[PDB]
Design a protein around this nucleic acid. Structure first.
Lengths: 116, 92, 164, 98, 67, 166, 406
RNA sequence: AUUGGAUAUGCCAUAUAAAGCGCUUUCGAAGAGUCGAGUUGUUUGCAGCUCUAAAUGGGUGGUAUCAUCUAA
RNA sequence: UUGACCUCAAAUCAGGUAGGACUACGCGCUGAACAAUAAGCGCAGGAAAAGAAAAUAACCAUGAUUCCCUCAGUAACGGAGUGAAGCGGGAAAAGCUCAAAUUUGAAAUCUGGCAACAUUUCUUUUGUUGUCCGAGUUGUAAUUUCAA
């Protein structure tokens, strides 16, 4: 049993086309969602800042985005993670606010019945 | 202290021919009552208060809402001419 | 085998006379039929469509979860339990819960009669919570009869292991 | 500008935060209705043959006998201790009445 | 993209609901009896306020009646 | 609700009421066939919490398997073979005696329109759910093959991955 | 200033002697040990300086609790909470009240949200400051204790020193008010003619309704232990064609003063108010004064009373008659016949059950009455266990006692 | 010639309706022949067999009380 | 005598569905010699399985699953040999549905027949509306899933 990698260039191209196929479907919006900034959970890496999964409910509440609309504008929600320190809260609230400063949200049509 | 005693009901027990040096039956238990009378140790007294402390919703003091949803749906069908009215059914 | 007291209590049911009086009050409080409800709703629909305040309906209460809820809230005045519920565990706790809440209760014969009152094929339990002011005396008389014929009667065999 | 600097270091200045309790951690809390339902069922349903043995042992003193029996059937001693306290309360409630 | 978004939001900006025939009559009967500024007493009425709307809903019915 | 009483009563598995009923019902169930249709679940609380709804397209079947592989898993596969037009949803223990263990299986008809129009059970209609009990995709099947999360619960290691540039 | 507008909205222009000598020093962040009599206008004395303090520091909900106020009993705490609502009508600083006998599970969620101005009692406050996770109080900068002599009279000895060991002491401004100077007050400060009716509980309201009908053409005032009881009693009486004014109002101080002024000016009419609300108000020449519920502070009540005085006493509370003997106060017993008592209990129960707001008020009044009863200082005289809950609900218009968490 | 998602524009829209976010003197249900204990095999898992639970409980970790999770 | 309900039935009653084949890649139950392998048996799809923590960790904490790289031929087991995993870096990212609380001022729910009206990858496919019957109170909808 030997696993060959002759399809390594083919997989590189296939993933690139998936990125372009996705961008064709969603024309003006980014192909990835915004990820939070977290700290790896060990003494070896806790000084590094890496990308998280989603923003905590306390982060979203502070930034002014409700958890029901956060997913609609591309902000992932992590119900599992929590803010044990005020630094993680401030690092990711600013990340959300900067995200909302650069965001153009196109309006949607709404059904308005003629009567009351 | 526990005195390191030994109860008379422990699982372990004491005692070619094994005589060199020194240091089954179907026995019942007792006449036991297998069908004891019902013992009301909890409902012998009446609980005077309702079990639930949840507040009473306003839906129980107002006309039914899902009936109103049906009434508006039936009225719409009458306006759209989908449901024959009682007078129309009677005259037909 | 020997029937436990919780299951043996369902062999002693309400007698002929008191059960007849029970269903006579119940038949005055039957729920609105699917047909009758439809006529009343379209009548309001015609009023709404042309141009347009009622009273709270009075009827018997049915459904196991609903009735057990009413007993726990002490809203029920009389609970009638079918004596032949096929899995008996659905009602085996009901007489004791009615005892804990001090709700008058009886075990009437068969579930077909209970279901007929509510326009269904089968009702495991019925409960009466509210009656009109003219039926207060009739309900009070039945509660006394149920107590005298079902609670005052027996009350000693329901603690005994029946069967065998 | 939106973008994450994925390198190291953000600042060693740290200050703890106070978090509330998640609703999952409330599991195991006893409800008023649930305790009522369990008491009703415990009375309506009888007692297991081993529970009747433990109850009759407790009545005639013999506490070590009851604890040993409960541990043998249930398993760990924690389960056995809980059953003795439960069955003792059943006896006392019954003895107050019958 | 930004100019198109703002011009569509301005066009689809009518977020004020006018009262219907039933809503108008419902709030009118309550106002013509319990004044205009007291909404808590309006909601606590059982005969005129049969639907048992709270003070907030009656306030919204008033506000929508004005516009 | 009355299902809190039924769930609490089912924990007293050999109280006076439960032992008498289990003895009585075991005698009856042995009179009928090995696999026989149940008009209604004997444990309406347990069937209800395992996904069963009292509506058309939901079928309850009882089965006895000899004691002395998992018994619940054997009940599911035999019942699923018995009525091969249905999808096995779940199963639960109802009774046992010295010789037999009795189980009830909840089956769902994927061709009935009350099932195909319910989005909450629509998933079972798809052909990827054909004979879930035969591939270990039921609750007991998942438990039997050690499927779970944690440290409590080979081909990629026996291979030799050889990259292009290595 | 928003504080000034709220004060004007509350209906207050002039200041009292206690306020004159306390507000200026309080604005300078000076710890003060005050000694003012009951109902001397203290409510504006200790509340408005710390409200300006909260505005000055620009406190936000995320900062947690910055002001803590300790009250002896629930009813006094609720009135202080009501006053704080009036004062903070034009502010964005959050406020809340936690008290014994209330929903602790709900208060924990309220504290986690962030409540700046907190009104509490020693029993509940210590519980929340120990076991409530996420309750932020490290920013506390103003603590106030009211009725310290009363607080130590209740039985909060072991709690007052225990709670102070947890709360921060540095930078914190401290206030202590005590009408009477015992030895315990300084110890905590250094570290920081009658008439009675033996009426059964279930017939209490029916006797009161019959009595008020008989004396419709006179001036009657009734004291009841809880404000929630006042609101329900007034609302119920107005629903049976018995127009009776109430001092509860809509928890607006201006309306309460207006209602009291109208009652005093009117030659006839009946007004319902609590003992605490009536404490500190000049009682006019009223023909009848009625004590429907036992007073929270009998020591204050006997001094306050000293045309006709009536007291509704349950048979289980006849021990209070022995207490009145030890206080050297003359009294007489009034007897009533059951035939003159109106038998509208069945009608009363039907009316309450049919209406939503009447039933909602009755449940709140019943819960508040029981909680006030359970917190009485005279445990031996007014024992909640000796009370029959079935009879109490009957007087409130219930067929069965509502489920209240004690 | 088939069909995707949108856009724009008409006609209808059963809204007496349904939601998100504030607040709480009110409440807050959580899966049993299962967990687990003992004993036999297969490989901690799985299974058979005997017994058989709990409600701030239960699982899993760091303590050698704390942390984390919320199974059937 | 009749009726309601339950149970057992029957029917060339109406409408559906299962089997068998292919199995490179899924997933199961098994199982030798020498490998948790071959073979045997069962069950699928365009992927399958897994999956929104009864998961890690001991940190400034992480955050469903899957896959790749690394960890690492390391710890551990048992000297040989067997041989992981947390972290870390990537690919892709999406979350949710019930059981358990009374709609109780109204079973608000659903299949089928019949009759019209549409619609079609399509006279071959899909529905909608009305009416009747049945299902269902031993519980079908709305509401809730602990993140609440």
């Amino acid at each position: 049993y030997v696993k060959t990698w002759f399809n390594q260039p083919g997989r590189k191209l296939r993933r690139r086309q998936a990125r372009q196929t996705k961008a064709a479907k969603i024309a003006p919006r980014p192909v990835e969602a915004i990820r939070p900034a977290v700290k790896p959970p060990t003494i070896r890496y806790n000084m590094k800042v890496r990308a998280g999964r989603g923003f905590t409910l306390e982060e979203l509440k502070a930034a002014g985005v409700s958890r029901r609309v956060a997913s609609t504008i591309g902000i992932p929600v992590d119900h599992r993670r929590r803010n044990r320190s005020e630094e993680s809260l401030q690092r990711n609230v600013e990340r959300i606010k900067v995200y909302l400063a650069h965001l153009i949200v196109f309006p949607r049509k709404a059904g308005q019945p003629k009567k009351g | 202290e526990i005195d390191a005693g030994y109860s008379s009901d422990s699982s372990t027990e004491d005692v070619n021919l094994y005589i060199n040096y020194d240091i089954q039956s179907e026995i019942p238990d007792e006449n036991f009552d297998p069908y004891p009378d019902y013992d009301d140790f909890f409902t012998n007294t009446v609980r005077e208060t309702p079990l639930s402390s949840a507040p009473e919703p306003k839906r129980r003091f107002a006309p039914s809402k899902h009936e109103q949803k049906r009434i508006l749906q039936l009225a719409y069908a009458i306006r759209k001419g989908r449901i024959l009215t009682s007078e129309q059914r009677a005259e037909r | 085998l020997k029937v436990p007291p919780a299951i043996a209590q369902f062999q002693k049911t309400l007698d002929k006379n008191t059960a007849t009086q029970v269903f006579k009050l119940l038949n005055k409080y039957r729920p609105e039929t699917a047909a009758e409800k439809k006529q009343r709703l379209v009548a309001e629909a015609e009023a709404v469509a042309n141009g347009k305040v009622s009273k709270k309906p009075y009827n018997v209460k049915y459904g196991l979860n609903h009735v057990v809820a009413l007993i726990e809230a002490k809203k029920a005045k009389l609970v009638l339990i079918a004596s032949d519920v096929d899995p008996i565990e659905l009602v085996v706790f009901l007489p004791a819960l009615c005892k804990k809440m001090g709700v008058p209760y009886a075990i009437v014969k068969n579930k077909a009669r209970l279901g007929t009152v509510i326009h269904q094929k089968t009702a495991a339990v019925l409960a009466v919570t509210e009656v009109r002011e003219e039926d207060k005396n009739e309900l009070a008389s039945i509660v006394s009869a149920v107590d005298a014929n079902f609670s005052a009667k027996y009350d000693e065999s329901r603690r005994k292991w029946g069967g065998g | 500008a939106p973008g994450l600097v994925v390198g190291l270091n953000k600042g060693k200045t740290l200050t703890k935060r106070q978090l509330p309790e998640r609703p999952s951690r409330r599991k195991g809390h006893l409800s008023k209705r649930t305790a009522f339902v369990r008491s009703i069922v415990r009375e309506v349903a009888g007692f297991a043959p081993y529970e009747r043995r433990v109850m009759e042992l407790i009545r005639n003193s013999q506490d070590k006998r009851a604890r040993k029996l409960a541990k043998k059937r249930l398993g760990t001693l924690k389960r056995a201790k809980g059953k003795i306290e439960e069955l003792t309360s059943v006896i006392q409630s019954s003895r107050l009445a019958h | 993209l930004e100019e198109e978004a703002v011009k569509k939001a301005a066009r689809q900006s009518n977020k004020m609901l006018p009262l219907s025939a039933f809503e108008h009559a419902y709030i009118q009967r309550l106002i013509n009896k319990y004044g205009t500024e007291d909404f808590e007493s309006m909601a606590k009425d059982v005969k005129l306020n049969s639907k048992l709307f709270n003070g907030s809903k009656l306030k919204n019915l008033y506000i929508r009646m004005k516009a | 609700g009355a299902y809190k009483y039924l769930e609490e009563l089912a924990k007293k598995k050999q109280s006076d009421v439960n032992l008498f009923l289990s003895r009585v019902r075991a005698w009856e169930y042995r009179q009928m066939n090995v696999i026989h249709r149940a008009s209604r679940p004997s444990r309406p609380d347990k069937a209800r919490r395992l996904g069963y709804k009292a509506k058309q397209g939901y079928v309850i079947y009882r089965i006895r398997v000899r004691r002395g592989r998992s018994a619940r898993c054997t009940a599911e596969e035999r019942v699923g073979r018995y009525c091969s037009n249905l999808r096995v949803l779940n199963s639960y223990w109802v009774n046992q005696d010295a010789t037999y263990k009795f189980f009830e299986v909840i089956l769902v008809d994927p061709s009935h329109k009350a099932i195909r129009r319910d989005p909450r059970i629509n998933w079972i209609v798809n052909p990827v759910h054909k004979h879930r009990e035969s591939r270990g995709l039921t609750s007991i099947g998942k438990k039997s093959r050690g499927i779970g999360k944690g440290h409590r619960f080979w081909l990629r290691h026996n291979t030799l991955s050889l990259r292009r540039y290595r | 200033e928003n504080i000034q507008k709220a004060i004007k909205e509350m209906g207050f222009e002039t200041m009292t002697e206690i306020q004159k000598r306390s507000i200026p020093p309080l604005l300078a962040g000076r710890d003060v040990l005050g000694a003012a009599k009951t109902g001397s206008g203290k409510t504006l004395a200790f509340l408005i300086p710390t409200i300006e303090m909260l505005y000055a520091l620009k406190f936000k909900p995320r900062n947690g609790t910055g002001v803590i106020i300790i009250s002896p009993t629930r009813e006094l705490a609720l009135q202080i909470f009501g006053v704080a609502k009036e004062l903070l009508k034009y502010h964005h600083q959050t406020f809340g009240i936690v008290i014994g006998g209330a929903n602790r599970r709900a208060e924990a969620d309220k504290l986690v949200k962030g409540v700046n101005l907190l009104v509490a009692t020693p029993g509940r406050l210590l519980d929340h400051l120990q076991n409530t996770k996420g309750f932020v109080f490290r920013n506390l900068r103003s603590l106030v204790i009211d009725e310290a002599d009363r607080i130590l009279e209740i039985g909060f000895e072991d709690e007052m020193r225990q709670i102070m060991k947890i709360l921060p002491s540095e930078n914190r401004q401290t206030l202590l008010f005590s009408a009477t100077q015992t030895t315990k007050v300084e110890d905590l400060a250094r570290i920081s003619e009658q008439g009675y009716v033996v009426v059964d509980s279930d017939k209490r309201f029916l006797l009161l309704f019959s009595f008020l009908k008989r004396n419709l053409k006179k001036k009657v005032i009734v004291f009841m232990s809880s404000c929630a009881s006042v609101k329900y009693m007034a609302e119920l009486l107005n629903y049976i064609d018995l127009p009776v004014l109430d001092l509860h109002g809509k928890q607006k101080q201006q309306r309460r003063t207006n209602t009291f002024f109208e009652f005093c000016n009117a030659e006839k009419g009946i007004l319902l108010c609590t003992n605490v609300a009536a404490r500190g108000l000049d009682i006019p020449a009223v023909d009848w004064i009625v004590q429907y519920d036992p007073p929270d502070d009998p020591r204050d009540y006997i001094h306050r009373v000293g045309g006709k005085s009536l007291m509704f006493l349950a048979p289980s509370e006849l021990g209070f008659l022995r207490y009145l003997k030890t206080a050297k106060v003359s009294l007489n017993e009034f007897e009533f016949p059951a035939n003159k008592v109106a038998n509208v209990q069945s009608q009363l129960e039907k009316l309450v059950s049919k209406n939503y707001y009447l039933q909602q008020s009755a449940k709140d009044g019943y819960r508040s009455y029981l909680q006030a009863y359970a917190s009485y200082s005279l445990k031996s005289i007014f024992d909640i266990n000796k009370l029959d809950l079935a009879k109490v609900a009957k007087s409130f218009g219930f067929a069965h006692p509502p489920n209240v968490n004690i």
